Amino acid sequence: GSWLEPNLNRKKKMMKGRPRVPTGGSTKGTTVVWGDYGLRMRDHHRRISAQQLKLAEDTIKQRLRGQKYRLYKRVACNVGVYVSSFDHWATRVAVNQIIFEIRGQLHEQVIRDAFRLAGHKLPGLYEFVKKGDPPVVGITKLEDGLTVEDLKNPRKK
């Protein structure tokens, strides 16, 4: 299939479920793994549809058309949303998780405008992320030598 249309059966109905809420120190999906810049969902955890992610991609392509770039998608719509029968494909995203990635012979300011315009089409609040910055454990970035064990330590004061 694709990242917007999985190779699943539409007839088999799924339960609503809930996006992943890591309460044990996980940092999965919070760092840029392939591209140079990324688009992070920094406020809350949602369920994005395949129509909202396709418009976000179209937005970036429209702004960066005629230029050399490589866009990676770090999410897949493998959740069938049934609105009373099948309605559309969606994806559950946790907080502070990367949505897109980009790399190419572009100016950083030109990419900010692309991801900025894509943060309006998608639901929620998004943040421009570079490669090499620390991960996010919950809603706390592990910066200034902060580790995942200091957030688990009861003594913090």
Partner: protein, 98 residues
């Protein structure tokens, strides 16, 4: 809804003073039981588990005394006075990073 449960989202300076004193009162009970046994060279598994994974009132941050973790809130935080029987229940630790 229509039934009004008028619960403010934040606590007053008078409730906070009693929350501080209630956390500091549970520390004296665990410090009295922990020292009473040490004199006899004895220990309990629940007294050693508490001191390990729970902080004292002087080691807690203000946001850990007056707030708890609620996954359904915008910033994953909720007033601690919203917890059932919060005045007679222990709640000091929240998931890391939240």
């Amino acid at each position: 809804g229509g039934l009004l449960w008028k619960i403010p989202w934040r606590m007053s300076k008078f409730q906070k003073l009693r929350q501080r004193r209630r956390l500091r009162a549970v520390d004296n009970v665990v410090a009295t039981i922990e020292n009473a046994l040490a004199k006899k060279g004895e220990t309990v598994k629940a007294v050693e588990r508490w001191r390990a994974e729970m902080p004292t009132e002087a080691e807690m941050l203000p946001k850990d005394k007056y707030t708890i973790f609620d996954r359904k809130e915008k910033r994953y935080r909720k007033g601690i006075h919203k917890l059932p029987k919060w005045t007679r229940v222990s709640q000091r630790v929240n998931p890391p990073g939240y």
